[PDB]
Write an enzyme that holds these catalytic residues in place. Structure first.
Site, PDB file in Angstrom:
ATOM      1  N   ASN A 114     -19.676  19.438 -16.421  1.00 38.96           N
ATOM      2  CA  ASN A 114     -20.981  18.845 -16.182  1.00 38.96           C
ATOM      3  C   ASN A 114     -20.969  17.712 -15.141  1.00 38.96           C
ATOM      4  N   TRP A 120     -18.212  32.131 -19.205  1.00 37.33           N
ATOM      5  CA  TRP A 120     -19.292  32.728 -19.988  1.00 37.33           C
ATOM      6  C   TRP A 120     -18.908  34.040 -20.649  1.00 37.33           C
ATOM      7  N   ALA A 180       0.859  -1.171   0.000  1.00 39.67           N
ATOM      8  CA  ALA A 180       0.000   0.000   0.000  1.00 39.67           C
ATOM      9  C   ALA A 180       0.893   1.219   0.000  1.00 39.67           C
ATOM     10  N   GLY A 192       8.164  -4.539   2.590  1.00 42.09           N
ATOM     11  CA  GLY A 192       9.194  -3.769   3.261  1.00 42.09           C
ATOM     12  C   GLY A 192      10.365  -3.450   2.355  1.00 42.09           C
ATOM     13  N   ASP A 213     -19.757  18.764 -24.830  1.00 38.15           N
ATOM     14  CA  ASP A 213     -18.407  19.029 -25.302  1.00 38.15           C
ATOM     15  C   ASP A 213     -17.432  18.260 -24.412  1.00 38.15           C
ATOM     16  N   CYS A 246     -27.911  23.118 -22.371  1.00 41.26           N
ATOM     17  CA  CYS A 246     -27.167  21.904 -22.681  1.00 41.26           C
ATOM     18  C   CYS A 246     -27.331  20.718 -21.738  1.00 41.26           C
ATOM     19  N   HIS A 247     -27.217  20.980 -20.440  1.00 43.07           N
ATOM     20  CA  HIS A 247     -27.748  20.077 -19.426  1.00 43.07           C
ATOM     21  C   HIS A 247     -29.219  20.453 -19.290  1.00 43.07           C
ATOM     22  N   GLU A 265     -20.010  28.819 -10.727  1.00 38.80           N
ATOM     23  CA  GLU A 265     -21.054  28.810 -11.744  1.00 38.80           C
ATOM     24  C   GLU A 265     -22.311  28.184 -11.147  1.00 38.80           C
ATOM     25  N   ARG A 312     -28.170  17.407 -23.997  1.00 36.87           N
ATOM     26  CA  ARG A 312     -28.437  17.353 -25.430  1.00 36.87           C
ATOM     27  C   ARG A 312     -27.176  17.549 -26.258  1.00 36.87           C
ATOM     28  N   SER A 313     -26.260  18.360 -25.747  1.00 38.03           N
ATOM     29  CA  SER A 313     -25.012  18.637 -26.446  1.00 38.03           C
ATOM     30  C   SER A 313     -23.830  18.667 -25.480  1.00 38.03           C
ATOM     31  N   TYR A 331     -14.449  18.598 -30.338  1.00 39.44           N
ATOM     32  CA  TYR A 331     -14.074  19.683 -31.237  1.00 39.44           C
ATOM     33  C   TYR A 331     -12.672  19.473 -31.800  1.00 39.44           C
ATOM     34  N   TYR A 354     -30.024  28.954 -17.722  1.00 37.93           N
ATOM     35  CA  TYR A 354     -30.172  28.137 -16.523  1.00 37.93           C
ATOM     36  C   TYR A 354     -30.212  29.115 -15.355  1.00 37.93           C
TER      37      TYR A 354
HETATM   38  N1  LIG Z   1       2.601   0.175   3.150  1.00 37.12           N
HETATM   39  C1  LIG Z   1       2.890  -1.123   3.184  1.00 37.12           C
HETATM   40  O1  LIG Z   1       2.204  -1.951   2.608  1.00 37.12           O
HETATM   41  C2  LIG Z   1       4.097  -1.576   3.953  1.00 37.12           C
HETATM   42  C3  LIG Z   1       4.948  -0.641   4.531  1.00 37.12           C
HETATM   43  N2  LIG Z   1       6.028  -1.036   5.219  1.00 37.12           N
HETATM   44  C4  LIG Z   1       6.908  -0.031   5.818  1.00 37.12           C
HETATM   45  O2  LIG Z   1       8.195  -0.092   5.195  1.00 37.12           O
HETATM   46  C5  LIG Z   1       9.228  -0.399   6.137  1.00 37.12           C
HETATM   47  C6  LIG Z   1       9.941  -1.677   5.709  1.00 37.12           C
HETATM   48  O3  LIG Z   1      11.139  -1.828   6.468  1.00 37.12           O
HETATM   49  P1  LIG Z   1      12.561  -1.979   5.728  1.00 37.12           P
HETATM   50  O4  LIG Z   1      13.638  -2.052   6.784  1.00 37.12           O
HETATM   51  O5  LIG Z   1      12.641  -0.932   4.642  1.00 37.12           O
HETATM   52  O6  LIG Z   1      12.443  -3.423   5.028  1.00 37.12           O
HETATM   53  P2  LIG Z   1      11.926  -4.697   5.865  1.00 37.12           P
HETATM   54  O7  LIG Z   1      11.747  -4.276   7.304  1.00 37.12           O
HETATM   55  O8  LIG Z   1      10.774  -5.320   5.113  1.00 37.12           O
HETATM   56  O9  LIG Z   1      13.182  -5.702   5.787  1.00 37.12           O
HETATM   57  C7  LIG Z   1      14.432  -5.345   6.372  1.00 37.12           C
HETATM   58  C8  LIG Z   1      14.838  -6.405   7.389  1.00 37.12           C
HETATM   59  O10 LIG Z   1      14.872  -7.687   6.753  1.00 37.12           O
HETATM   60  C9  LIG Z   1      16.165  -8.293   6.844  1.00 37.12           C
HETATM   61  N3  LIG Z   1      16.702  -8.521   5.479  1.00 37.12           N
HETATM   62  C10 LIG Z   1      16.159  -8.075   4.337  1.00 37.12           C
HETATM   63  N4  LIG Z   1      16.925  -8.478   3.298  1.00 37.12           N
HETATM   64  C11 LIG Z   1      17.956  -9.183   3.802  1.00 37.12           C
HETATM   65  C12 LIG Z   1      19.041  -9.830   3.228  1.00 37.12           C
HETATM   66  N5  LIG Z   1      19.209  -9.824   1.884  1.00 37.12           N
HETATM   67  N6  LIG Z   1      19.926 -10.466   4.025  1.00 37.12           N
HETATM   68  C13 LIG Z   1      19.764 -10.475   5.355  1.00 37.12           C
HETATM   69  N7  LIG Z   1      18.726  -9.858   5.934  1.00 37.12           N
HETATM   70  C14 LIG Z   1      17.810  -9.206   5.178  1.00 37.12           C
HETATM   71  C15 LIG Z   1      17.078  -7.332   7.594  1.00 37.12           C
HETATM   72  O11 LIG Z   1      17.540  -7.952   8.791  1.00 37.12           O
HETATM   73  P3  LIG Z   1      19.045  -7.708   9.310  1.00 37.12           P
HETATM   74  O12 LIG Z   1      19.224  -6.212   9.215  1.00 37.12           O
HETATM   75  O13 LIG Z   1      19.036  -8.247  10.720  1.00 37.12           O
HETATM   76  O14 LIG Z   1      19.895  -8.501   8.345  1.00 37.12           O
HETATM   77  C16 LIG Z   1      16.227  -6.124   7.945  1.00 37.12           C
HETATM   78  O15 LIG Z   1      16.153  -5.990   9.369  1.00 37.12           O
HETATM   79  C17 LIG Z   1       8.578  -0.568   7.503  1.00 37.12           C
HETATM   80  O16 LIG Z   1       9.099   0.416   8.404  1.00 37.12           O
HETATM   81  C18 LIG Z   1       7.092  -0.332   7.298  1.00 37.12           C
HETATM   82  O17 LIG Z   1       6.679   0.799   8.072  1.00 37.12           O
HETATM   83  C19 LIG Z   1       6.311  -2.336   5.369  1.00 37.12           C
HETATM   84  C20 LIG Z   1       5.492  -3.311   4.812  1.00 37.12           C
HETATM   85  C21 LIG Z   1       4.368  -2.929   4.094  1.00 37.12           C
HETATM   86  C1  LIG Z   2     -18.998  22.746 -19.340  1.00 38.81           C
HETATM   87  C2  LIG Z   2     -19.324  23.867 -19.063  1.00 38.81           C
HETATM   88  C3  LIG Z   2     -19.736  25.277 -18.713  1.00 38.81           C
HETATM   89  N1  LIG Z   2     -19.121  26.204 -19.643  1.00 38.81           N
HETATM   90  C4  LIG Z   2     -19.950  27.088 -20.441  1.00 38.81           C
HETATM   91  C5  LIG Z   2     -19.737  26.792 -21.906  1.00 38.81           C
HETATM   92  C6  LIG Z   2     -20.270  27.640 -22.871  1.00 38.81           C
HETATM   93  C7  LIG Z   2     -20.074  27.366 -24.220  1.00 38.81           C
HETATM   94  C8  LIG Z   2     -19.344  26.248 -24.604  1.00 38.81           C
HETATM   95  N2  LIG Z   2     -19.148  25.976 -25.943  1.00 38.81           N
HETATM   96  C9  LIG Z   2     -18.423  24.865 -26.324  1.00 38.81           C
HETATM   97  N3  LIG Z   2     -18.236  24.606 -27.615  1.00 38.81           N
HETATM   98  N4  LIG Z   2     -17.891  24.021 -25.369  1.00 38.81           N
HETATM   99  C10 LIG Z   2     -18.082  24.285 -24.028  1.00 38.81           C
HETATM  100  O1  LIG Z   2     -17.529  23.586 -23.180  1.00 38.81           O
HETATM  101  C11 LIG Z   2     -18.811  25.402 -23.639  1.00 38.81           C
HETATM  102  C12 LIG Z   2     -19.006  25.674 -22.290  1.00 38.81           C
HETATM  103  C13 LIG Z   2     -17.708  26.248 -19.774  1.00 38.81           C
HETATM  104  C14 LIG Z   2     -17.119  27.136 -20.664  1.00 38.81           C
HETATM  105  C15 LIG Z   2     -15.735  27.179 -20.793  1.00 38.81           C
HETATM  106  C16 LIG Z   2     -14.941  26.331 -20.028  1.00 38.81           C
HETATM  107  C17 LIG Z   2     -13.448  26.377 -20.166  1.00 38.81           C
HETATM  108  O2  LIG Z   2     -12.906  27.221 -21.008  1.00 38.81           O
HETATM  109  N5  LIG Z   2     -12.710  25.555 -19.425  1.00 38.81           N
HETATM  110  C18 LIG Z   2     -11.263  25.549 -19.511  1.00 38.81           C
HETATM  111  C19 LIG Z   2     -10.689  26.713 -18.713  1.00 38.81           C
HETATM  112  C20 LIG Z   2      -9.843  26.213 -17.548  1.00 38.81           C
HETATM  113  C21 LIG Z   2      -9.334  27.392 -16.753  1.00 38.81           C
HETATM  114  O3  LIG Z   2      -8.865  28.394 -17.335  1.00 38.81           O
HETATM  115  O4  LIG Z   2      -9.375  27.380 -15.504  1.00 38.81           O
HETATM  116  C22 LIG Z   2     -10.683  24.262 -19.004  1.00 38.81           C
HETATM  117  O5  LIG Z   2      -9.608  23.830 -19.472  1.00 38.81           O
HETATM  118  O6  LIG Z   2     -11.266  23.608 -18.113  1.00 38.81           O
HETATM  119  C23 LIG Z   2     -15.530  25.442 -19.137  1.00 38.81           C
HETATM  120  C24 LIG Z   2     -16.914  25.400 -19.009  1.00 38.81           C
HETATM  121  N1  LIG Z   3      -0.966  -3.835   0.219  1.00 38.22           N
HETATM  122  C1  LIG Z   3      -0.758  -3.861   1.558  1.00 38.22           C
HETATM  123  N2  LIG Z   3      -1.586  -3.176   2.378  1.00 38.22           N
HETATM  124  C2  LIG Z   3      -1.393  -3.192   3.713  1.00 38.22           C
HETATM  125  O1  LIG Z   3      -2.162  -2.556   4.466  1.00 38.22           O
HETATM  126  C3  LIG Z   3      -0.336  -3.917   4.247  1.00 38.22           C
HETATM  127  C4  LIG Z   3       0.504  -4.615   3.390  1.00 38.22           C
HETATM  128  N3  LIG Z   3       0.276  -4.572   2.060  1.00 38.22           N
HETATM  129  N4  LIG Z   3       1.543  -5.334   3.865  1.00 38.22           N
HETATM  130  C5  LIG Z   3       1.847  -5.422   5.293  1.00 38.22           C
HETATM  131  C6  LIG Z   3       0.875  -4.629   6.138  1.00 38.22           C
HETATM  132  C7  LIG Z   3       1.044  -4.613   7.638  1.00 38.22           C
HETATM  133  N5  LIG Z   3       0.989  -5.975   8.149  1.00 38.22           N
HETATM  134  C8  LIG Z   3       0.025  -6.328   9.032  1.00 38.22           C
HETATM  135  C9  LIG Z   3      -0.028  -7.630   9.519  1.00 38.22           C
HETATM  136  C10 LIG Z   3      -1.017  -7.993  10.424  1.00 38.22           C
HETATM  137  C11 LIG Z   3      -1.954  -7.056  10.844  1.00 38.22           C
HETATM  138  C12 LIG Z   3      -3.022  -7.448  11.821  1.00 38.22           C
HETATM  139  O2  LIG Z   3      -2.883  -7.171  13.002  1.00 38.22           O
HETATM  140  N6  LIG Z   3      -4.097  -8.091  11.373  1.00 38.22           N
HETATM  141  C13 LIG Z   3      -4.243  -8.412   9.962  1.00 38.22           C
HETATM  142  C14 LIG Z   3      -3.992  -7.099   9.231  1.00 38.22           C
HETATM  143  C15 LIG Z   3      -5.300  -6.483   8.749  1.00 38.22           C
HETATM  144  C16 LIG Z   3      -6.417  -6.878   9.686  1.00 38.22           C
HETATM  145  O3  LIG Z   3      -6.628  -6.170  10.695  1.00 38.22           O
HETATM  146  O4  LIG Z   3      -7.088  -7.896   9.417  1.00 38.22           O
HETATM  147  C17 LIG Z   3      -3.236  -9.431   9.521  1.00 38.22           C
HETATM  148  O5  LIG Z   3      -3.277  -9.838   8.339  1.00 38.22           O
HETATM  149  O6  LIG Z   3      -2.393  -9.835  10.350  1.00 38.22           O
HETATM  150  C18 LIG Z   3      -1.901  -5.755  10.357  1.00 38.22           C
HETATM  151  C19 LIG Z   3      -0.912  -5.391   9.451  1.00 38.22           C
HETATM  152  N7  LIG Z   3      -0.141  -3.935   5.581  1.00 38.22           N
END
Ligand SMILES: NC(=O)C1=CN([C@@H]2O[C@H](COP(=O)(O)OP(=O)(O)OC[C@H]3O[C@@H](n4cnc5c(N)ncnc54)[C@H](OP(=O)(O)O)[C@@H]3O)[C@@H](O)[C@H]2O)C=CC1
Ligand SMILES: C#CCN(Cc1ccc2[nH]c(N)nc(=O)c2c1)c1ccc(C(=O)N[C@@H](CCC(=O)O)C(=O)O)cc1
Ligand SMILES: Nc1nc(=O)c2c([nH]1)NCC(CNc1ccc(C(=O)N[C@@H](CCC(=O)O)C(=O)O)cc1)=N2
Ligand SMILES: NC(=O)C1=CN([C@@H]2O[C@H](COP(=O)(O)OP(=O)(O)OC[C@H]3O[C@@H](n4cnc5c(N)ncnc54)[C@H](OP(=O)(O)O)[C@@H]3O)[C@@H](O)[C@H]2O)C=CC1
Ligand SMILES: C#CCN(Cc1ccc2[nH]c(N)nc(=O)c2c1)c1ccc(C(=O)N[C@@H](CCC(=O)O)C(=O)O)cc1
Ligand SMILES: Nc1nc(=O)c2c([nH]1)NCC(CNc1ccc(C(=O)N[C@@H](CCC(=O)O)C(=O)O)cc1)=N2
Ligand SMILES: O=c1ccn([C@H]2C[C@H](O)[C@@H](COP(=O)(O)O)O2)c(=O)[nH]1
Ligand SMILES: O=c1ccn([C@H]2C[C@H](O)[C@@H](COP(=O)(O)O)O2)c(=O)[nH]1
Lengths: 508, 508
Positions: free
Chosen positions: B421, B303, B9, B113, B413, B389-390, B281, B410-411, B453, B329
């Site tokens: 819209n 406009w 994530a 990680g 752009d 138009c709307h 608008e 109806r029309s 256009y 409108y």
């Molecule tokens: N958003 C998400 O889905 C997730 C986010 N995260 C975040 O990212 C971070 C991940 O932590 P990060 O440290 O970057 O990576 P990890 O924590 O996933 O892995 C690092 C750890 O794994 C061991 N390890 C990994 N590769 C090797 C290797 N080739 N040889 C030996 N050991 C290895 C290391 O142990 P050692 O140093 O002892 O060798 C190290 O402590 C977390 O802080 C978490 O918050 C993590 C998971 C999911």
């Molecule tokens: C739809 C609708 C309402 N309207 C009224 C309105 C009136 C006559 C129209 N005539 C035609 N041919 N097309 C339209 O979209 C049009 C729209 C709009 C008119 C202009 C823009 C416009 O020029 N938008 C640009 C400007 C962006 C900016 O400078 O911030 C853009 O890129 O978004 C948007 C809406």
């Molecule tokens: N794609 C992605 N999204 C995540 O949110 C995510 C991820 N990957 N990888 C690892 C992680 C964090 N890992 C974990 C592991 C366990 C729990 C836990 O306590 N229970 C569930 C997690 C979600 C839940 O509450 O069910 C679990 O799977 O263990 C939470 C986070 N989170």
């Protein structure tokens, strides 16, 4: 192993395929298909074999078919070593050694004859079937394709097509016996975590017991499945709700349907529809009429309920005549913003005539983006026997000179209101096009509150239990000078063979 | 063999995963997801190994995770035979052996990680990569996920989700190395035979060169794709054609887009959207204003074009002041059928308050199906700087008190109009909700003329070359007692990280 597919063309209802050695109809696109299919193959150094009865061989002209090998099954015919692109066999099973060698043959098509189909089927030789349903059904036959054994299931149904005003579908039954996991699962999991919180779950896929012809998974082309599916879609997620009518419904919000109008006319077949009524009302609109009686006279009762002394009286319009419906659709089409008195007054010249300015911009300025016709007039609403459901439509001229239509409908009675709604706006679009020199485009209906009245449940479920037949064709017997001139007689409904009518009560 | 997926994530922008050994954020649903994915298995007698670096082992508490087996990669940790659900290996490659026996371990997950992720990737050990993108970029991190190597391709992206105002996606990247034909063929054939006669052909699937993130085939769940695709779908079937301006467009007819609002705000991320303008608008409309100046004074120049004296004169409204747009409108919203005079007059009490009613209706009658608000008034179009138009919208209260919306345009752009819209109509709904006490529902948009256009192509092409990031979140800082009291200050747009802004000129 080697593939074996039947290829035939039968009448939609009785499966007739033959008459006095000839086909019962003449459709060139179909043969063009038959050709393409019998001929498609991977190994260019290989050829497809088309097994066929003799009597057929005779109709075929006793001459070979380009690029392919004909295989005649006959008892008398002599094994002629003369032509290498035909050969005779004494029976069907023996002929089916094409697999057992002749590695040159890539695929095998059972290629017809009532006798030769029935046997290829009985003896269980065929895997697929390429069935062309021809809408046209009222004419003598002596040969018939058999009843597709229950071991076969429809997996495709092409959109309805038209040739010489004859409608026809291309569907391919397959015989079954016996994208990744990753995604489907990730979604299933994400579906448990989040609940109704994931829009996906708000829209669930219909269950097979409410899905029309569920065997057709990836090839629901036939645009009837645009309605049958919306049906089953609320039947699945429809949320139970009360409403003014007194009959609760199951409803989702924001659906859409589509229809082709070029090759067919979206009159549902899964149920016999009241087309004439659909018409006499649509004309009633075009004329700009609001007198409910003018429909009761041509024996159309769709507008009695929302019409009566009692209902009227009940909604605040008891000052109204038995059947004065106020400025509903039509009055709003022909007289926008007109000060409505009663249905008896002469409204000519009052209010905006939308319909007219419509036809006018339609032909005078085609690519204009304001081909809009509306019926939602706030100022009026309170006087109407009921507000507009088909609230606003927008019309669109293609480059190929075709007229497409878009309708928004706020409240759609999928049971009774829609079938009519799809048809009506088809017809109105055609009339519109015929009057402006353009032809049927497409049809898109966008629904807001798509619902099913709870007393329409056992019915809609039966309807869903019917496999769709080809949409018919609608034709005008004459060209009219004014759009308000059409008559029921000026209409030709060609090739409509629906399932029987499904009785459903209206929710007043 | 045996599968190896990476689960992680990271922040949308810089891929930040670490801070002082703690996850830089706390999203339970995300962890819930993690638990679900690392537990997903087929054989009830097998388990999944979860590999993590010591530093993470520590952060997770050095306690075993129920039902799974943790494998710690560390140099110093002892090989404690104590726990049978945890085990230590000296180097990653070692470990993964796993595989090279333990028919017990069914699947493998690198639970990551930075140090292990990097190494897990560099040595090409990982098959899949489940990535949870987190919409919060503006905090200090100390550990990051690596850059996903080119060998990996996104095959899925979830809709945006929201927790504690934090927006996030769930997508999965697969690594590349190297229906049923019968249908894709029977349909390709009918495609040759029939031509533009087969509807399917008038609607052709976009080409990869114009499809956004084409690697995601079945898993396009993100709702930015509801617009990004409509785009790439006209870019494919867009019929070139002229219109009232000097710029022609490529258009199609009848398109639809869907957006969630329950967990996000459909602000396009693929490009930086003038949000403050979209707002000003909208509030402008709500107040029922028509004086295009008021927008200029607030540095909103949309406009301008359709307001210049040179323009107003060009369409026959030269009698109108410098920016009096007329009953567009807002006047239609708050004063339907009001007899427009000038933009300086006192229209209070004149016409029909649609908005007003719409609200009293949403509150007092929810299941009511006539929640409708229109702007298309035939009688006023003429004196209107630009038609609506709307054109109309319908609102809808779920059984669980959520407000949904539907718009017919109806029309549209797709270059400049649509973006606005989508937002302007999210917002308005949300507002309507906060005033009727509901929560946001869904938003659907049914378009008519969906066009581009011809002077936007190089731009929309650029835009299209960008992978959409999670939608932001928009909350109101106070509960107004009256819909029109809202002010820009009142809006909190949390989590917006859109790609660079894209310049595109408007067609007056
Ligand atoms: N958003 C998400 O889905 C997730 C986010 N995260 C975040 O990212 C971070 C991940 O932590 P990060 O440290 O970057 O990576 P990890 O924590 O996933 O892995 C690092 C750890 O794994 C061991 N390890 C990994 N590769 C090797 C290797 N080739 N040889 C030996 N050991 C290895 C290391 O142990 P050692 O140093 O002892 O060798 C190290 O402590 C977390 O802080 C978490 O918050 C993590 C998971 C999911
Ligand atoms: C739809 C609708 C309402 N309207 C009224 C309105 C009136 C006559 C129209 N005539 C035609 N041919 N097309 C339209 O979209 C049009 C729209 C709009 C008119 C202009 C823009 C416009 O020029 N938008 C640009 C400007 C962006 C900016 O400078 O911030 C853009 O890129 O978004 C948007 C809406
Ligand atoms: N794609 C992605 N999204 C995540 O949110 C995510 C991820 N990957 N990888 C690892 C992680 C964090 N890992 C974990 C592991 C366990 C729990 C836990 O306590 N229970 C569930 C997690 C979600 C839940 O509450 O069910 C679990 O799977 O263990 C939470 C986070 N989170
Ligand atoms: N819609 C479609 O797709 C198709 C429709 N058709 C229609 O159907 C009609 C054809 O049907 P049908 O009249 O039954 O002709 P068939 O296609 O059944 O041909 C049968 C022929 O094969 C010979 N034969 C039959 N059984 C055997 C056997 N056991 N061993 C050896 N030879 C055998 C017979 O001649 P013999 O007496 O010498 O044995 C007979 O002439 C045509 O008129 C055509 O219009 C035809 C094809 C396709
Ligand atoms: C939609 C629409 C326009 N309308 C107007 C209309 C008026 C009130 C309504 N009230 C309710 N609750 N639902 C509606 O569909 C409805 C429709 C229709 C009204 C009735 C029928 C109807 O009863 N059809 C029956 C009768 C067929 C027959 O007489 O043989 C049917 O089986 O089709 C159809 C359309
Ligand atoms: N699906 C189907 N449609 C049919 O019309 C049909 C059928 N199957 N099976 C048998 C049959 C009657 N026999 C035959 C024999 C030859 C041709 C034929 O014309 N074959 C040419 C067609 C070329 C063309 O029409 O352009 C071929 O290309 O093989 C048609 C029907 N007709
Ligand atoms: O054109 C039409 C005529 C009316 N109805 C149905 C829709 C709703 O079921 C119904 C009831 O009325 P409202 O409460 O939505 O106004 O009539 C249609 O579906 N389409
Ligand atoms: O909400 C809006 C405001 C107007 N436009 C654009 C669409 C067309 O480019 C033009 C409308 O002019 P018409 O050609 O449809 O009359 O303005 C939008 O796209 N959306």
């Amino acid at each position: 192993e080697k593939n074996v597919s039947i290829v035939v063309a039968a009448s939609v209802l009785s499966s007739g395929i033959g008459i006095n050695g000839q086909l019962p109809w003449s459709i060139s696109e179909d043969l063009k298909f038959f050709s393409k299919i019998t001929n498609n193959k991977c190994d260019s150094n290989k050829k497809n074999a088309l097994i066929m009865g003799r009597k057929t061989w005779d109709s075929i002209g006793r001459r070979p078919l380009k690029n392919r090998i004909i295989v005649v099954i006959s008892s008398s015919l002599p094994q002629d070593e003369a032509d290498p692109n035909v050969v005779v066999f004494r029976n069907l099973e023996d002929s089916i050694e094409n697999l057992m060698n002749d590695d040159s043959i890539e695929n095998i098509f059972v290629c017809g004859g009532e006798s030769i189909y029935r046997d290829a089927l009985k003896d269980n030789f065929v895997d697929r079937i390429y069935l062309t349903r021809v809408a046209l059904e009222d004419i003598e036959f002596d040969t018939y394709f058999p009843e597709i054994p229950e071991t076969f299931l429809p997996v495709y149904m092409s959109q309805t097509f038209c040739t010489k005003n004859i409608s026809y579908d291309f569907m391919i039954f397959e015989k079954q016996e016996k994208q990744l996991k990753s995604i489907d699962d990730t979604v299933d999991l994400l579906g448990e975590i989040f609940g109704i919180r994931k829009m996906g779950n708000r829209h669930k896929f219909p269950k097979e017991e409410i899905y029309n012809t569920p065997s057709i998974r990836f090839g629901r082309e036939h645009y009837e499945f645009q309605y049958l599916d919306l049906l089953s879609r609320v039947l699945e997620n429809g949320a139970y709700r009360e409403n003014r009518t007194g009959i609760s419904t199951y409803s989702i919000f924001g659906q859409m349907m589509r229809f082709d109008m070029r090759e067919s006319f979206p009159l549902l077949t899964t149920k016999k529809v009241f087309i004439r009524g659909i018409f006499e009302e649509l004309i009633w609109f075009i004329k700009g009429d609001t007198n409910g009686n003018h429909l009761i006279e041509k024996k159309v009762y769709i507008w009695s309920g929302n019409g009566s002394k009692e209902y009227l009286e009940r909604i605040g319009l008891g000052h109204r005549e038995e059947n004065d419906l106020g400025p509903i659709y039509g009055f709003q089409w022909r007289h926008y913003n007109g000060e409505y008195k009663t249905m008896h007054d002469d409204y000519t010249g009052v209010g905006v005539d939308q319909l007219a300015k419509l036809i006018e911009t339609l032909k005078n300025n085609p690519k204009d983006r304001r081909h809009i016709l509306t019926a939602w007039n706030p100022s009026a609403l309170s006087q109407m026997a009921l507000p507009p459901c088909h609230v606003l439509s927008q019309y669109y001229v293609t480059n190929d000179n075709c007229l497409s239509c878009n309708l928004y409908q706020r409240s759609c009675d999928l049971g009774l209101g829609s079938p009519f709604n799809i048809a009506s706006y088809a017809i109105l679009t055609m009339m519109l096009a015929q009057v402006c020199g353009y032809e049927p485009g497409e049809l898109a209906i966008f629904i807001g509150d798509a619902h099913i009245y709870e007393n329409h449940l056992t019915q809609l479920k039966e309807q869903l239990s019917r496999t769709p037949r080809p949409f018919p064709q609608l034709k005008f017997k004459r060209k009219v000078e004014n759009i308000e001139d059409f008559k029921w007689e000026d209409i030709e409904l060609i090739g409509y063979y629906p399932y029987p009518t499904i009785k459903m009560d209206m929710a007043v």
